[PDB]
Amino acid sequence: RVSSGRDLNCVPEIADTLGAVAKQGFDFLCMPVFHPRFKREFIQEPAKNRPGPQTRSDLLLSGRDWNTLIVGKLSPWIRPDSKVEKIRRNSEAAMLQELNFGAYLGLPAFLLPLNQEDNTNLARVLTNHIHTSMFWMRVPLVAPEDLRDDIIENAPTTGEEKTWMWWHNFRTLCDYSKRIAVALEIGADLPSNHVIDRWLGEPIKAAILPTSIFLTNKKGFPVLSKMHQRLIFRLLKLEVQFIITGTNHHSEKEFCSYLQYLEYLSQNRPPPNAYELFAKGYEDYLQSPLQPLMDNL
Amino acid sequence: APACMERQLEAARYRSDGALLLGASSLSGRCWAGSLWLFKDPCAAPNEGFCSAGVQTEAGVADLTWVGERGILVASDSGAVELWELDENETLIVSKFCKYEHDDIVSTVSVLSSGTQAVSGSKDICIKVWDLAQQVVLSSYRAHAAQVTCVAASPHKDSVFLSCSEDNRILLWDTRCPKPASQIGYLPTSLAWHPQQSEVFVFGDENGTVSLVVLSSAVHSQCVTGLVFSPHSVPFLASLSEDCSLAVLDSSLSELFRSQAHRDFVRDATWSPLNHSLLTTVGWDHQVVHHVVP
Amino acid sequence: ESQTYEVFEKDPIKYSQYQQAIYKCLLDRVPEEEKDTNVQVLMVLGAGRGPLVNASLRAAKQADRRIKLYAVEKNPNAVVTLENWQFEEWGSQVTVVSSDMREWVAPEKADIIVSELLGSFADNELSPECLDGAQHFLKDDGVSIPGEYTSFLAPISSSKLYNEVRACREKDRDPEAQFEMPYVVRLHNFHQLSAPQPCFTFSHPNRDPMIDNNRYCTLEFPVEVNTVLHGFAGYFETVLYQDITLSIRPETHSPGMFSWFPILFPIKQPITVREGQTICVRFWRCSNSKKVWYEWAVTAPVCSAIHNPTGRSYTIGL
Amino acid sequence: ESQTYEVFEKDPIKYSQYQQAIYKCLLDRVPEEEKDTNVQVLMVLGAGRGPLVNASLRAAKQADRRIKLYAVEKNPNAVVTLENWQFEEWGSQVTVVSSDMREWVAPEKADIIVSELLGSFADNELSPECLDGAQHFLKDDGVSIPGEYTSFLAPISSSKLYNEVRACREKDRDPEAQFEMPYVVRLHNFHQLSAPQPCFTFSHPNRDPMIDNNRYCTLEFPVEVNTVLHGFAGYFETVLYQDITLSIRPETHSPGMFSWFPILFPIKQPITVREGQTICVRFWRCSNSKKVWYEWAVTAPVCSAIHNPTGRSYTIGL
Ligand SMILES: *c1cnn(CC(=O)Nc2ccc(C)c(S(=O)(=O)NCCc3ccccn3)c2)c(=O)c1Cl
């Protein structure tokens, strides 16, 4: 079937939460390793010597559960490309700390955001870490500034390609590393079409779907528009994992219904021909050409 | 009431008759949850045995407000806005409603002049307006481009509030209009209206600088976390920061008092209504410190 | 990683032995008449996730005496686990410290110190360095556990292993470096050519102004068959307290103790030996302020080159 | 080696400048009325074979005051030369010390300290580290010479140099490491694309609890021609005492001062630039308890990779 997960930012008890998650039919959960509102000081006193423990323990789950069911997340207050030196230094230290705790837990992947143009020092810190798990970069199709409403009188509203340039420059700085991949966020309005084709070729491992793009059917079930359906069809080929984020606005319907809609979409697709079938297991597998004159087969 | 209290204390608010409201959350260890507390005798805090009422929340407390006399509004880690009311004899605390409308953490909450509506802001960039009698959202406004840090209501008009963000904007709102928001260095962090005047307010910055709206002063080393005005007929201004210090300023942004009592982040300040010379502060070191101010 | 610590904690023989040794030491240090006055200060140095700490508490109970525990660990991720288990269970008995042995300013003095810094060749994880950097906040009538450890070496022949070494070649380095570095390996298809003989020995505490952990040894092994020489295998024995001991030596192995495998030192070129001849070998243990390493060479019956000069292929970082 | 020291000692401009600065400092520190009571304690840290020591004696004579010299050198072979010259000439004025700045227990406090720990890029030989490890046996009204130094960077184009780098490849390492390390070189056939701008700056003594010698800088260079980018060249200026200065900057070079050549930082792939565009570049200065290094990258007009992460190709050992 298709694989999907749940994105959260409030996990009071880890075991109960993971249980409910798996119950609704989710395969993995993405969650913070530290508390998101718990800023740490490393350089200056007296807060430098805050008593521990600084986080919850590893012995709450099992090694294989860590290894298979949990994706990590970086805390929002961490901003390495700030213009205030102090904040930037603290952010560097905290970032390394969280990444190393992730390594200690044996996590299969870790989520990191791109929400602006300059992420040079972030790339530096991560590049240091690597030369010492996969890393999923959270990057949207549309920038949040090009996404707000026209309700400010003295600052009016109006370029489809800036968010791709962000990712491209990042990956160039990191030197086209294998352990670095895309996590594409999707929203209500969609860009053109040559664009969507541009995100072809890129190492997309996951797609993020908010609850706010699902319309409601006459019966009260969740559905999607047709352009969204087209895009989903195209993504299903690359074989990505989908993540649901946000609140259940259809409080009548549990998350299981979203997932069943997704499975329904997957099932009703133009099945694979004889080629596509034969071509199973060879996608992007390099081979040396045959020489039936110099060699014998 | 709960057996133990959480170690991180975030909010502290006096009411008219002198009672004290406290808010705590757990940020480390096994369980990350919250609790609320009422102390009629504030000098007996933070002892869970000498409280008058207390309750345990599902999740963490980020902010809270008195709603007149009986009500408590809470911003939550869940992404919910929560209303509790006290029992007739102030012996218990009970939930009135719990609406999940934000898609991420609710960072800040403020009540409006009339005492019947309220505004909420989140890390999901949406601002909403609530009617507290009907339990609905009247409005969702997505104007900012990043996380919202502080909203502040005006004490003289029931349609005007302020909003700040990590995108470096400060907006003035009036819902009476069709385009409600209007615009006005370093990032802004905290806000406060002047009680007397109806056009003046203060704001704090990422670097350590306070400003009257111009006028400016460098007060702390780290981020300004809060700003509160004294109830004096001519008010003083309390300033609390991340450098673990407190300061009280006069009407000229000149420093009058400074305290290093705390060993960690200071989170809130509240002036007592009985004695206008007294000020209380809380923090993540689990201290409730009482200050007598000249 | 957490998995490593998990695998470590699964062998109960070693922890039972540690427990017994602690029990015995405390019975011998504190008479039966001051049971309720003399509190002994213990220290676990290299506490990890805290099985030694628990073994110590168990042992003090067993003996029915009174102790006071300090735990020192320089890895913060494990300190997280320790502080949780402390808040939930241990309590005030136990004080956690996040620091290196060699930099910590102790409040008071200890009666006993306890460590698990032992690898397959005894000293190859740097127990002497660390415990020497720690011996000053141990008092005069102080005890170390372990107090003694010894390593062993023996010769072997094996084409399979030689070819597995051949295969450990990798780009961007000397094409003979894989022969100049040791390996931990469960030996199976191989032939041993002569009994094991002792190499280096350490004892704690070291009450000498001339602390030199550098060493030089020479060994001669008689042969009784024609064959080839492909390397040397290593073992070790330790004395925890008097009669409590641990060994991976194949003649005196401890039953059911599977924490450690043997260690293999290789040579570049195989050496042909004949019956009655005698293999001789030299080993050095060397040092600077930054690093420790080993060097080895065969002298008889034919000479070899010196393996790993200046640590050009293998170093143990301080 | 002795030859290196010989070549160093052959530029008299620098030593005349040092002499003048010392003269001035002493005239300003000791009034004309206590000439015969106040003895000033000087220290040469990094004394080598002792031209600074002689310059200091000359200067004290010139000023007609009284001093007391300590010399510290961690190389024993040069200490031989120093002790000979001491026994034969200097006498009791001068006390020789064989030690590292960072480990020496001084008898008393100094008034002035003097150092020559400057390379082509100012800080690339580790003057900040050392002088910070030395500032505690300097007193409150103490003076350092130098007190200030600053580095500079500018862009260039040159096929010849790029091909000479291409050629510095060698076996048993990464085939792109020669692009991730700097070089000292007398630049000749090259084109400079824009003026030099300041990079990092240090000042001594450092009266701050937060001693951080780590640094981050960003720079933007305007262009006025179409061309290629092949690297960045480096320079430096220093302030010895007030108005006495030294520079290798091509706009303010000191006359006849040929001790230092420029330093070249390269990039892996050339970058094409057009008129009106703007090159931006980032540099970092990084550290651990063992090593110091640099990292650099181009952002505009096109992005490059980060050069030399974790010091994988160039390190300056402490
Ligand atoms: C949890 C899990 N599954 N269900 C059943 C469910 O998901 N039903 C569902 C989903 C989506 C749609 C659009 C409908 S419908 O009836 O509007 N159209 C039929 C499409 C469909 C989907 C899946 C299977 C078959 N047919 C119904 C739940 O109700 C929960 Cl709560």
Domain boundaries, chain C: 2-145, 148-317
Q: Distance from the CA of A6 to the center of ligand 1, in angstroms?
A: 19
CB contact under 8 A, B105 and A147: no
CB atoms within 10 A of CB A253: 16
Using omega within 30 degrees of 0 as the cis cutoff, is the peptide bond preceding D31 cis?
no
Query: Is C164 part of any known ligand binding site?
Result: no
Q: Which amino acid is at C263?
A: I
Q: Which of these, C252, C235, C269, C151, lies nearest to C199 by C-alpha position?
A: C151
| Gap between the Cα atoms of B271 and B263, Å rounded | 21
d(CA D126, CA D110): 22
CA D36 to chain centre: 36
Q: For chain B, what is the domain count?
A: 1
What is the C-alpha to C-alpha distance for residues A6 and A28, in angstroms, rounded to an integer?
7
DSSP string, C145-157: ES-EEEEEEEEEE
* Strand duo B209-212 + B201-205: pairing: antiparallel
Interface list for A 256-295 with B (CB within 8 A): none
Residues, chain A, total?
297
- Give the domain CATH number at A230: 3.20.20.150
Q: Is B254 helix (H, G, I), strand (E, B) or coil?
A: coil
Amino acid at C62: Q
Q: Give the number of other Cβ atoms within 10 Å of residue A19's Cβ.
A: 10
For residues A222 and A216, is the Cβ–Cβ distance under 8 A? yes
Fold of C148-317: Hnrnp arginine n-methyltransferase1 (2.70.160)
- Measure the CA–CA gap between C91 and C79, rounded to whole angstroms: 15
Residue D111: its H or E element: strand D110-114
CB contact under 8 A, B103 and A211: yes
D242: left (phi over 0), alpha (psi -120 to 50) or beta: left
CA–CA distance, B220 with B98 (Å, rounded to integer): 38
Nearest neighbour of A173 by CB, restricted to D216, D306, D310 = D306
Binding-face residues of D in 160-199 toward A, CB within 8 A: none
Contacts with A120 (C-beta within 8 Å, 6 or more apart), sequence order: A81, A173, D282, D297, D299
Find out whether C125 is annotated in a ligand binding site. Answer: yes
Cβ atoms of B84 and B74 within 8 Å: the answer is yes
Please name the residues between 83 and 102 in chain C that touch chain A, using a CB distance below 8 Å.
83-85, 87, 96
User: In a 3-state reduction of DSSP, which class is residue D210?
Assistant: coil
Give the span between the Cα atoms of A87 and C219, in whole angstroms.
60
CA distances from D86 to D6, D54, D71 (A): 19, 11, 11
C246: burial class by Cβ within 10 Å (0-12, 13-18, 19+)?
buried
- Residue A207 dihedral angles phi and psi, to the nearest 5°: -125, 140
3-class DSSP state of B185? coil
**Would you call B43 helix, strand, or coil by DSSP?**
helix
Cα-only R_g, chain A: 22
Residues 6+ apart with CB under 8 A from D3: none
| Residue A220 alpha carbon to ligand 1 centre in Å | 10
Tell me, yes or no, whether A273 lies in a domain: yes
- DSSP state at residue C206: -
Which two structure tokens, joined as six digits, stand for D226?
């179409």
What is the Cα–Cα distance from D220 to D197, expressed in whole angstroms?
9
- Report the number of secondary-structure helices (H) and strands (E) in chain C: 6, 16
Query: Which residue minimizes the CA distance to atom 17 of ligand 1?
Result: A221
Q: Are B59 and B24 in contact (CB under 8 A)?
A: no
What are the backbone dihedrals phi and psi of residue D137, each rounded to the nearest 5 degrees, phi first?
Answer: -90, 20
In terms of Cβ atoms closer than 10 Å to its own Cβ (0-12, 13-18, 19+), residue B202 is buried
Token representation of residue B61: 């407390």
Interface touch C76/A97, C-beta < 8 Å: yes
The residues of C carrying an active-site annotation are 116, 125
D100 annotated to bind ligand: yes
| CA nearest neighbour of A49 among C97, B33, B245 | C97
Tell me how far apart the alpha carbons of residues A183 and A163 are, in angstroms, rounded to a whole number: 12
Locate the chain C residue with the closest alpha carbon to D175.
Answer: C172
How far the first Cα of chain D sits from its last, in Å, is: 20
Common-topology check for domains C2-145 and C148-317:
no
Half-sphere exposure of D270 (CA within 13 A, CB side): 16
Q: What is the DSSP letter of B232?
A: S
3-state secondary structure of B180: coil
Task: Please count the other Cβ atoms lying within 10 Å of the Cβ belonging to residue A281.
Answer: 6
Helix (H, G, I), strand (E, B) or coil at B161: strand
- What percent of chain B is helix, strand and coil (3-state, nearest 5)? 0, 50, 50
Q: Which of C216, C231, C293 is nearest to C267 (CA)?
A: C231
Å from CA of A261 to ligand 1 middle: 6
The helix/strand/coil state of B149 is strand
CA distance linking residue D153 with residue D200, whole number of Å: 10
Provide φ and ψ at C59, rounded to 5°: -65, -45
> What's the CA gap between D25 and D23, in Å, rounded?
6
Separation in Å, CA of C80 to nearest CA in chain B: 9
DSSP SS3 for C70: strand
Structural domain range at position A186 = 4-287
Judging by beta carbons within 10 Å of its beta carbon (0-12, 13-18, 19+), is residue B91 exposed, middle or buried?
Answer: exposed
Domain membership of residue A44 (yes or no) is yes
Among C94, C111, C109, residue whose Cα is nearest residue C50? C94
Angle at Cα A22 formed by Cα A20 and Cα A28, nearest 5°?
120
C-alpha C165/C-alpha C177 separation (Å) is 10
Return the sign of the alpha-carbon dihedral for residues D248, D249, D254, D255.
Answer: positive
- CA nearest to B78, candidates B99, B56, B105: B105
Q: Searching chain A, which residue's CA lies closest to the CA of residue B124?
A: A246
Residue A20 tokens, joined = 């409910």
State the Cα–Cα distance between residues C299 and C297, nearest whole angstrom: 7
Nearest to D54 by CA among D8, D22, D76, D97: D22
Tokens coding C206:
């070291």
Q: Assess contact for D264 and D185: CB atoms under 8 A.
A: yes
Pairing of β C215-222 and β C148-157: unpaired
Distance CA C313, CA D1 (A): 28
For residue A1, with 0-12 CB atoms within 10 Å meaning exposed, 13-18 middle and 19 or more buried, which class applies? exposed
B179 inside 8 A of chain C by CB: no
| C-beta separation of C273 from C304 below 8 A | no
Tell me the residue ranges of DSSP E strands in C109-260: 110-114, 138-145, 148-157, 183-184, 191-192, 197-203, 215-222, 227-241, 244-247
3-state secondary structure of C66: coil
CB–CB of B216/B208 below 8 Å? no
Backbone angles phi, psi at C6, to 5 degrees: -65, -45
End-to-end CA distance of chain B: 37
CATH of C2-145, one of 3.40.50.150, 3.40.50.2300, 1.10.10.10, 1.10.3720.10: 3.40.50.150
Closest CA to A144 of A112, A181, A110, A114: A114
Which residue among B30, B105, B244 sits closest to A46, beta carbon to beta carbon? B244
C177, C261 Cβ separation under 8 angstroms: no
C-alpha neighbours within 13 Å on the C-beta side of residue D193: 30
- How many Cβ atoms from other residues are within 10 Å of residue B188's Cβ? 22
Residues on chain C touching B30 (C-beta within 8 angstroms): 84, 88
In the structure, which protein residues have their CB atom closer than 6 angstroms to any atom of ligand 1? A 217, 219, 221, 223, 253-254, 256-257, 260-261, 264
Query: Please, which residues bridge with residue D281 across strands?
Result: D219, D298
Supply the angle between the helices D12-29 and D51-63 in degrees, to the nearest 10. 40
**Which residues fall within 8 angstroms of residue D297, CB to CB, at 6 or more apart?**
A120, A173, D281, D282, D303, D304, D305, D306, D307
User: Is D14 labeled as ligand-binding?
Assistant: yes
Q: Please report where in the chains the tokens 């008449």 appear, as a residue.
A: C33
Measured in angstroms, the resolution is 2.4
Plot region of D145 (φ>0 → left; ψ -120 to 50 → alpha; else → beta) = beta
Record the tokens describing residue A114, joined without a space: 């791109």
Q: What are phi and psi of D298, to 5 degrees?
A: -100, 135
What is the spatial distance between Cα D60 and Cα D29, in angstroms, rounded to a whole number? 12
For residue C146, the one-letter residue type is: P
CB burial of A76-111 (b: ≥16 within 10 Å; e: otherwise) equals bbbbbebebebbebbbbbbbebbbebbbbbbbebbb
| Alpha carbons B258 and B261: distance in angstroms, whole number | 9
Tokens of D168: 């510095």
Cβ distance C283 to C217 under 8 Å? yes
| C-alpha separations of D63 from D13, D26, D57 in Å | 19, 7, 10
Please give, one letter per residue, the 3-state secondary structure of chain A.
Answer: CCCEEEECCCCCCHHHHHHHHHHHCCCEEEEECCCCCCCCCCCCCCHHHCCCCCCCCCCCCCHHHHHHHEEEECCCCCCCCCCCHHHHHHHHHHHHHHHHHHHHHCCCEEEEECCCCCCHHHHHHHHHHHCCCEEEEEEECCCCHHHCCCCECCCCCCCCCHHHHHHHHHHHHHCCCCCEEEEEECCCCCCCCHHHHHCCCCCEEEEEEEHHHCEECCCCCEECCHHHHHHHHHHHHHCCEEEEECCCCCCCCCCHHHHHHHHHHHHCCCCCCHHHHHCCCCCCCCCCCCCCCCCCC
Cα atoms found within 13 Å of the Cα of residue C255, Cβ hemisphere only: 0
D231: closest CA among D139, D166, D170, D136?
Answer: D166
- DSSP secondary structure code for residue D306 in this structure: P
Q: Do the Cβ atoms of D295 and A124 come within 8 Å?
A: yes
Q: How far apart are CA A8 and CA A71, in angstroms?
A: 11
∠A248-A252-A256 over CA atoms, to 5°?
Answer: 65
A238, amino acid identity: L
Deposited experimental method = cryo-EM
Phi (first) and psi of residue C56, to 5 degrees: -65, -45
Where would I find the H helices in D9-94? 12-29, 51-63, 76-85
Q: How far is the C-alpha of D127 from the C-alpha of B24, rounded, in Å?
A: 50
Q: Which of C32, C95, C7, C21 is nearest to C55 (CA)?
A: C21
